[PDB]
Amino acid sequence: SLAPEDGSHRPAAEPTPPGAQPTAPGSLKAPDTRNEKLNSLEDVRKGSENYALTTNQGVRIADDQNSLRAGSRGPTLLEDFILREKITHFDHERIPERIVHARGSAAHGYFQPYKSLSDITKADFLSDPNKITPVFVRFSTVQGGAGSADTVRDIRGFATKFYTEEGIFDLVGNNTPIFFIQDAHKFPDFVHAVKPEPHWAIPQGQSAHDTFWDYVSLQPETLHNVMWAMSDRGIPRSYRTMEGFGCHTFRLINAEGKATFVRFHWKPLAGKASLVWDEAQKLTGRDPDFHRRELWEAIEAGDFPEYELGFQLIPEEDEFKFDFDLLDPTKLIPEELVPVQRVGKMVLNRNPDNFFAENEQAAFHPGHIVPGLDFTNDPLLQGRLFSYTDTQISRLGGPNFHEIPINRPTAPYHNFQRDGMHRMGIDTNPANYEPNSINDNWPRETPPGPKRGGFESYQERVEGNKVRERSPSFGEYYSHPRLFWLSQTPFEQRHIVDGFSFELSKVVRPYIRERVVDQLAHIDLTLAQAVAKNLGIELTDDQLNITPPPDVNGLKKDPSLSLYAIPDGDVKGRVVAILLNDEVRSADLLAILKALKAKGVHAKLLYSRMGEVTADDGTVLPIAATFAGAPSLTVDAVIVPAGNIADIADNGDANYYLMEAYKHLKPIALAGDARKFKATIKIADQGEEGIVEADSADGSFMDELLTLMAAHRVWSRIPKIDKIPA
């Protein structure tokens, strides 16, 4: 026995808040959570307790500490098969990462619709509010490698595999409603431009380099998604607090054969929330795994990520009723024009057991549709259909990638396909072709119908010549960027300007920065002047006189485009740093934790060392982390209880903690003598909005702090931060 006698090596198999226990594989941490897909993976789950260590051939190993040698200081012998198996498996552990979205984090859950949608789609998973469909969801960045950092500025992927009774449906979305380019033929161009440059393979996880901005300046169709990426949308607080979108118009097909155009939405029920850029960048350094960790810890604590699936629905006869083309994936459909209809709820409630086997090996692909859904001619979607099947032949080693356990349907699958590398299924059918008589033609085709029918494409009319041509209707590039900009709050606008400015400051060739500023002048003059000023660029008289693009279908803003214009805060699952001293006032701490508990807000107790300290009244307080070990970047607010403040008052790290949190617009609360820290962040004696202060930590002190947390950040503080050296 190497485990400690008190059993403190094994995490509690029950919900526990972040940091309370070591994290564990999902089937050990939450054995009681189940769904149909988790149950079906049981055949390949492997345990360990009480088993002998063996080769992969089942031979027990006696000594796993030494190679076989001729004498104990001699050479290693070729006959050591146990060594060579073990090192050969090690030597071949890695598979190619995904060409894009290589960095991602995943969990299991389930989906249910609020009511049957049979009047608009025959898709089985949407036919009955009692039908529960297991899901597996992977969130991701786009540009960086599997080993890159989470809180980079980038677009985020949001891919859901629905294991339906009529096949796998993968909804392969992102956290913005559009993409940078119009036609799939340019995807390698755009992706090569944003990826590390090919001579030296720099930079990782960043669009802040010459080739990205060269491409953008030369391809104005990109400006809409670039506006999103440069906003705080590019730096979400959590995968739990971002929106998801299906990116294209698809179709729903009902049993009558009626097509309705649809765009897909995910609404985060935890609300929308983003970091600020200096915080996101610094966090890539202090914890490059912060989003993967926050997602896994949320599920272990029971703060299950929840999302509402929604549909924007457009009748077929309304195809041409807008100012933009519905097939143009650089255009959004404003919610003011077409509201999102709520469809159902998805909950993510179980982590995987083994990251490589369930996360790294999962394959999502938007061609994976089911009866009741269909495509459209969006020319970016159209090319996606080719890529997601193709790429798996190298990434997952061949055409049997659907036999890798996480990718297996739970629906029946039978057909005449055979062989390929890694073939698991042993087919007993006497036939491997159809039509056949020797197996009475089974498995058999199934006609389309209202349920459980075969897939048939909607009979869309096609007319035109074979051309490599962009539709003229896609040739408008500035109105949607302008609608987005005008929909932002003034502080969201400032952060857009600061994102273009920082990024273009990293472009070495100045003419590329000038060309991008020229494009901005076509969108909005105020935005363009503000960026130009930060770059030392002066707009020409011609630039100052560019007519702004038209409004989109009479709209001059749509508030659903803003993260923050309309409050949608939720504090459950947020975290507060509590800065301790060597003689904490226990009554303050009891009131702080009581109020945080009641709203499902977590806490981390921090000090200048590990171990414990003892409160004024003898209560032993266990320290979670040092000030330096768990920086303010990792929390949503900071509370300092009263007590022996002298203990930490001249501690550089403790003062800096509050300066960093202050700069990043987080709520800060100081009780009693902790008010002494007001001097480090230059707060006046009469106080200021966003700093909660009182003689003790209750009556209204925690209500005030929790009201600040529900509004996420203290935006009114922005003018005060440029003066603080932090």
Q: Return d(Cα 264, Cα 249) in angstroms, integer.
A: 8
As a dihedral over the C-alpha atoms of residue 458, residue 460, residue 466, residue 472, rounded to 10 degrees, the angle is -120
363 binds, among ligand [S], a copy of itself, ligand HDE, none (CB under 5 to 8 A by kind): ligand HDE
User: Of residues 173, 481, 667, 672, which one binds ligand HDE by CB under 6 A?
Assistant: 173
Contacts of 670 (CB under 8 A, 6+ apart): 639, 640, 677, 678, 691, 692, 693
Closest residue by Cα to residue 142 from 182, 93, 193, 186? 193
Beta carbon nearer to ligand HDE, 329 or 631: 329
Where the chain is broken, by preceding residue (C–N > 2.5 Å)? Answer: none
437 binds, among a copy of itself, ligand [S], ligand HDE, none (CB under 5 to 8 A by kind): none
478 is in an annotated binding site: no
Residue 100 sits in the site that holds ligand HDE (CB under 6 A): yes
Residue 388 sits in the site that holds ligand HDE (CB under 6 A): yes
User: How many Å separate Cα 8 from the centre of its chain?
Assistant: 33
* Closest distance to ligand HDE from the beta carbon of 611 (Å): 36
User: Of residues 177, 220, 246, 288, which one binds a copy of itself by CB under 8 A?
Assistant: 288
Active site residue 651: no
Of residues 487-546, those binding a copy of itself (CB under 8 A) = 502, 504-506, 508-511, 513, 533-537
Q: Return d(Cα 551, Cα 476) in angstroms, integer.
A: 12
DSSP state of 463: -
Beta carbon nearer to a copy of itself, 340 or 537: 537
Query: Exactly one of 9, 39, 56, 174 is catalytic; which is it?
Result: 174
Please report which helix (H) or strand (E) contains residue 514, including its range: helix 510-521
178 binds, among ligand [S], ligand HDE, a copy of itself, none (CB under 5 to 8 A by kind): ligand [S]
DSSP state of 236: B
User: Of residues 17, 18, 157, 236, which one binds ligand HDE by CB under 6 A?
Assistant: 157
Of residues 318-377, those binding ligand HDE (CB under 6 A) = 329, 362-364
User: How many Å separate Cα 105 from the centre of its chain?
Assistant: 8
Beta carbon nearer to ligand [S], 314 or 512: 314
Of residues 135-154, those binding a copy of itself (CB under 8 A) = 144-149
Contact 79, 68 (CB under 8 A): yes
Residue 64 sits in the site that holds ligand HDE (CB under 6 A): no
Residues linked to residue 197 through DSSP beta bridges, in sequence order = 202
Residue 467 sits in the site that holds a copy of itself (CB under 8 A): yes
201 binds, among a copy of itself, ligand [S], ligand HDE, none (CB under 5 to 8 A by kind): a copy of itself
Residues linked to residue 670 through DSSP beta bridges, in sequence order = 640, 693
Name the segment binding a copy of itself (CB under 8 A); options: 70-78, 161-169, 245-253, 577-585: 70-78
317 binds, among ligand HDE, a copy of itself, ligand [S], none (CB under 5 to 8 A by kind): none
Alpha helices (H) in 219-343, listed in sequence order: 223-230, 277-286, 290-301
Beta carbon nearer to a copy of itself, 188 or 567: 188
DSSP state of 469: -
Beta carbon nearer to a copy of itself, 89 or 594: 89
159 binds, among ligand HDE, a copy of itself, ligand [S], none (CB under 5 to 8 A by kind): ligand HDE
Q: Return d(Cα 290, Cα 67) in angstroms, integer.
A: 40
Question: What is residue 619's three-state secondary structure?
Answer: coil
* Closest distance to ligand [S] from the beta carbon of 248 (Å): 6
Contact 606, 625 (CB under 8 A): yes
Residue 408 sits in the site that holds a copy of itself (CB under 8 A): no
Bridging pattern class, strands 306-315 and 259-268: antiparallel
Q: Return d(Cα 306, Cα 238) in angstroms, integer.
A: 12
Residue that has been written with the tokens 């969130």 in this structure: 139
Question: What is residue 525's three-state secondary structure?
Answer: helix
Residue 293 sits in the site that holds a copy of itself (CB under 8 A): yes
Residue nearest to ligand [S] (CB): 247
Question: What is residue 139's three-state secondary structure?
Answer: strand
Contact 396, 421 (CB under 8 A): no
Question: What is residue 510's three-state secondary structure?
Answer: helix
Locate 67 and state its tokens. Answer: 């190679």
User: Of residues 270, 380, 596, 692, which one binds ligand HDE by CB under 6 A?
Assistant: 380
Q: Return d(Cα 78, Cα 326) in angstroms, integer.
A: 65
Q: Return d(Cα 376, Cα 262) in angstroms, integer.
A: 10
Backbone angles phi, psi at 302, to 5 degrees: 85, 10
User: Of residues 126, 194, 247, 714, which one binds ligand HDE by CB under 6 A?
Assistant: 247
User: Of residues 207, 359, 400, 586, which one binds a copy of itself by CB under 8 A?
Assistant: 359
Of residues 90-129, those binding a copy of itself (CB under 8 A) = 90-99, 102-103
Residue 385 sits in the site that holds ligand HDE (CB under 6 A): no
Residue 611 sits in the site that holds a copy of itself (CB under 8 A): yes
588 binds, among ligand HDE, ligand [S], a copy of itself, none (CB under 5 to 8 A by kind): none
* Closest distance to a copy of itself from the beta carbon of 666 (Å): 16
In order, the DSSP letters of 643-680 are S-GGGTTT-HHHHHHHHHHHHTT--EEEEGGGGGGGGT
Query: Exactly one of 35, 50, 92, 101 is catalytic; which is it?
Result: 101
Name the segment binding a copy of itself (CB under 8 A); options: 109-117, 166-174, 363-371, 718-726: 718-726
Contact 513, 587 (CB under 8 A): no
Residue 2 sits in the site that holds a copy of itself (CB under 8 A): yes
Contacts of 173 (CB under 8 A, 6+ apart): 157, 158, 159, 160, 244, 245, 246, 247, 264, 266
Name the segment binding ligand HDE (CB under 6 A); options: 94-102, 200-208, 551-559, 708-716: 94-102
Report how far apart, in Å, the C-alpha atoms of 574 and of each of 18, 164, 237 are: 10, 33, 10
The CA angle 95-412-306, to the nearest 5 degrees, is 65
Q: Return d(Cα 341, Cα 308) in angstroms, integer.
A: 10
Residue 99 sits in the site that holds ligand HDE (CB under 6 A): yes
Please report which helix (H) or strand (E) contains residue 394, including its range: helix 392-395
Residue 59 sits in the site that holds a copy of itself (CB under 8 A): no
The CA angle 398-400-404, to the nearest 5 degrees, is 110
Active site residue 248: no
* Closest distance to ligand [S] from the beta carbon of 605 (Å): 42
Residues linked to residue 104 through DSSP beta bridges, in sequence order = 140
Residue 50 sits in the site that holds a copy of itself (CB under 8 A): no
* Closest distance to ligand HDE from the beta carbon of 91 (Å): 6
Name the segment binding a copy of itself (CB under 8 A); options: 158-166, 304-312, 377-385, 567-575: 377-385
Closest residue by Cα to residue 15 from 593, 678, 724, 573? 573
Residue 159 sits in the site that holds ligand HDE (CB under 6 A): yes
Residue 104 sits in the site that holds ligand HDE (CB under 6 A): yes
User: Does a cis peptide bond (omega within 30 degrees of 0) precede residue 203?
Assistant: yes
Residues linked to residue 266 through DSSP beta bridges, in sequence order = 244, 309
Beta carbon nearer to ligand [S], 248 or 585: 248
Q: Which amino acid is residue 587, in one-letter code? A: A
Q: Which residues make up the interface to ligand [S] (CB under 6 A)?
A: 178-179, 247-248, 329
Beta carbon nearer to ligand HDE, 100 or 299: 100
Of residues 637-676, those binding a copy of itself (CB under 8 A) = 650-653, 655-656, 659, 663
User: Of residues 17, 27, 37, 101, which one binds ligand HDE by CB under 6 A?
Assistant: 101
Residue that has been written with the tokens 């890539």 in this structure: 284
* Closest distance to ligand [S] from the beta carbon of 378 (Å): 8
**Residues forming the active site:** 101, 174
Binding-site positions for heme read 388
Binding-site positions read 388
The residues that touch ligand HDE, with contacts defined as CB under 6 A, are 91, 98-101, 104, 138, 140, 157, 159, 172-174, 179, 184, 187, 247, 329, 362-364, 380, 383-384, 387-388, 391
